[PDB]
Structure formats: structure tokens, C-alpha cells
Design an enzyme around this catalytic site. Sequence first.
Site: not given
Ligand SMILES: [Ca+2]
Ligand SMILES: [Ca+2]
Ligand code: NA
Ligand code: NA
Length: 481
Positions: A102, A159, A181, A198, A229, A259, A298, A428
Site C-alpha cells: 500500500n 499520491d 487511486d 501512499d 495487506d 485482508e 449468553g 455461550d
Molecule cells: Ca493506498
Molecule cells: Ca494515484
Molecule cells: Na446465546
Molecule cells: Na495511491
Amino acid sequence: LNGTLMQYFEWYMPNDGQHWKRLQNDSAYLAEHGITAVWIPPAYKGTSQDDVGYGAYDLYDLGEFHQKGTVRTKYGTKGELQSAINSLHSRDINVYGDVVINHKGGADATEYVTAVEVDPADRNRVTSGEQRIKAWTHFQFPGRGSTYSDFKWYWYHFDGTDWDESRKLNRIYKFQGKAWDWEVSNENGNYDYLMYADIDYDHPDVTAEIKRWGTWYANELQLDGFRLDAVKHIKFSFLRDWVNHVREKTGKEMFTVAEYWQNDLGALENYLNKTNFNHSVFDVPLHYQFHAASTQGGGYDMRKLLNGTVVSKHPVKAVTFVDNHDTQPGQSLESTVQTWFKPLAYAFILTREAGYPQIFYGDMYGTKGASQREIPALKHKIEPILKARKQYAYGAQHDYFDHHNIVGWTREGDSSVANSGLAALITDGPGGTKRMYVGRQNAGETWHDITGNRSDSVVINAEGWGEFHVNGGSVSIYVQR
Ligand SMILES: [Ca+2]
Ligand SMILES: [Ca+2]
Ligand code: NA
Ligand code: NA
Ligand SMILES: OC[C@H]1O[C@H](O[C@H]2[C@H](O)[C@@H](O)[C@@H](O[C@H]3[C@H](O)[C@@H](O)[C@@H](O[C@H]4[C@H](O)[C@@H](O)[C@@H](O)O[C@@H]4CO)O[C@@H]3CO)O[C@@H]2CO)[C@H](O)[C@@H](O)[C@@H]1O
């Protein structure tokens, strides 16, 4: 195939450089308990030695170059990791590498960049005129030089950023001529921006470079797959293309799980659609159901566990889990499944037919944060549930989600796994009993609770039914003696 993933780290592990060696030394134990794959923490140099790995300074420094005050990553050296991987592979344990693409953190130097502020609640709204900032965007990699890759990073590969070094100001800055993006999550208007510098996935040199690093990384660690990620912040079509690209170049399946952090089945369905179902996602909604059940004493309706989850709608594409390094106490997505309920949640993910379950290092061995809310080591409570998966959780499933507290399921067994078959109950709330069908082919067998929570034997009748018991707030999993 009851594949079982393990996330082999937690947030607060000591920064002693021994983690890869620990993994190597745990491979026999993992294999014995049916673990068939491990997700390892990011293996490349972060912003310092004690970076958990999400800093992502240098994707080509796998603990090999002296950069950021250390050669080793938090986890150890490249060679130690490679030794752990060959040990895992010697027991048929696949290795999934964490892919943090990222952003990049910890740049070597600042550049003067023209930028505007954007609104952190609505990043499509510009909130300043143009201003000159000093941003951490220049990556030269002085300890590595050009070994493995001569690609250098500058402001125009990004960016934006969250820090102006000249004014010492934490704002979200979008660089001149840049645009966030899309497609990304539409939270906060556009959630491209998360932290650090970024990455600009509109830039063609960036898309080319991150794809080729992907192939390099797979080759370098002999990876069998990936864990992606922070994907809700990364252009979806790029992720799709990156996954196809590495598969094409390696010629391997490369199982990939992303994720995508949203408690919203529809948002996950959208992500799956936009990536053409070429990879899996963590079952975030299921995690939140476990969290909710574990904190409501519960009062939770345990029948809800079957609805609103990735595993309920797209079981082939669901990686189910109880907790992770972001949900554990003190971390940025804290929503910890409380200690008492955790074994029940593990029974749910491990002994049911749907989904690819993942166990958490922090759950097995405890978390080592500085608080007194840390997750205790639950290894001994989880081991019999892992054994239930490995040896007993085969064949046709029958569900009994017919009560507010006490729910269960059976597995009939399969002729290809000797003595397989199980009957699980979780509650539970108060304990009690449930009659459940385990298959006429198990008629007359004597079954017992592999967890040891209940000491009674259950004899399956001629019609394939048993009367199974569970304690208050507990789990029992009956299998053939
Ligand atoms: Ca990003
Ligand atoms: Ca961009
Ligand atoms: Na329950
Ligand atoms: Na970006
Ligand atoms: O060396 C160990 C084993 O390695 C290899 O197995 C791999 C697979 O090749 C991977 O694809 C993956 O398997 C996942 C699968 O990708 C995933 O979709 C999921 O499928 C489940 C599904 O969720 C569930 O709903 C139901 O339909 O059953 C499916 C599986 O039966 O989960 C799979 C794992 O359970 O990962 C494994 C390793 O964990 C290799 O092919 C094996 O021969 C080898 O033993």
C-alpha cells in the site's frame, strides 16, 4: 484435505531476532497438529529493527543489508528465514508471504513537494490551496545499493503522505498532479490514503516494479502463496493483475488471501467481484460475530453464526479466523474474542466443512504486550480441536443451530479416513444436551469428548443418533474412542 493455516506471529513478540529460528524449531510441532500452511510476518526491512513489518521500507532487504540501524529484520536474517522455510517445506507446510504494498515508510530523505490538504473524513474534499511541504518520499536504499534492484523511489511514485517535515505537521497531503487511486474502499470518501507514503498505482513504472518485486519475492523465499495487506486501500484492479502476474511468472498456484477489513459482507463481495474471485479474503464478519458472542454473556443468538459471513456465501474463498495481530489487545482493530469463548470459536472454524481456517500464534502461545489484558496461551485447549480437524472432521455435515445458546454440528466421517466422524457442541450460555445424527455407519460405536471437558462416553444408537452433552460456556467434540 483439511488444510489448516497458522498466522505465525503476534504484534508484541520480543525484538530479539530469533523468530525465524523459533519457526524452524516449531515445524515438527506444526506438522504433527495438521498445520499445512503458515502466514509469516512481512520479511523485509521496516522503518526500524523493531518494526512488526508493516512499515515497508525496503522490499528487497529480507534482513540482508545494514539499513535502519540493523541487518536483521525484527524476525532474523534472510538465511534464518530461508532455513525455516526449507524445514516447513520438508514437512509439507506451505509458506505464504505477507505483501505490504500500500505504502512505503521510513524514506531516506525528504523532497520539497507541492501538495494540498484533504479532509481526513472525506479525502475527495481539498481543504487548502497549494503549499510547499517536505515529504519523506526519497528512497535510495544506501545499505543495499542496486543489489537485486536499481529502482529508486521519489515523490512522483506516491499520491500523498501524512507528514510535513518543515512545519512538523500531521495532515493528509495529496501531491500536485496526483489523484487518489480507484477502485478502493469508499469509506472517508476515498480510503486510498492510510499511512506513510501512499503508493500511486496510476503510475506505470510503479505497477511494473511492484509486479516484478512480487515475482522476485516469491522466488527468493520459495513462497507457496501470499497474504495481501490492507487491500481496501489499494487499487482493486491492480491487486487482481498483480496476483495473475506472479502466478503467470512462477507457474505455481500461489494461493492468495487478502485482508479486506470491513465488517460488511457486501463490501467483501464487491472486492471479490472486482478481483474476479482470483483470491480469498479473511472472514472479517465471522470474526465480529465471535467477538460479539464472546462479550454478550449468553445474550447473543448463536443461530446468527450461520449468516452474514464470507464462509456462509463463498466458502471456497473464505479464510476463517478467530483473532489476528490487528484485533489482539491494544492494536488498531482491537476486537478480541474473549478468552472463555475462544475455544468454541476454534471448534467452529476447525471442525466444520466450510472455509480454510487459520489459527493465531497469539492464541496458541499468548500475546506479549505490556498490558494485563493479553491473550493467555491457549495451546492446550486448541490442540485437541486441531486433532479433531486433522483426524476426525470428514464427511457429510449436519447442523443443529436450533437454540439460542446450545448449537452443534456433526460429521459422519469418510471411509478414506479411518475412524473419522465427530459431534461438536458449543454454548455461550448454560450447558445441556443435544441429540444429533452422526450417520448410521457409526451405529454402536462409543464416542468420547476429545477436549476432555466432558468425561461421559456416548454410544451411537442403531439409527445413528447420539445424546451429546456440553458444559456451561464450553465446547465438547465427541469422536470414536
Ligand atoms: Ca493506498
Ligand atoms: Ca494515484
Ligand atoms: Na446465546
Ligand atoms: Na495511491
Ligand atoms: O503441503 C500441504 C498441502 O499443500 C497443498 O494444499 C494447498 C492447496 O493447494 C491450496 O489451494 C490451499 O487449499 C485451500 C483452498 O485453496 C481453499 O479454497 C479452501 O478450500 C476448502 C473450502 O474453503 C471449503 O469450503 C471446502 O469446500 O473444502 C475446501 C478444501 O477441501 O481451503 C483449502 C485448504 O483446506 O491450501 C492448501 C494447503 O493448506 C497441496 O495441494 C496438498 O496436496 C498438500 O497436502
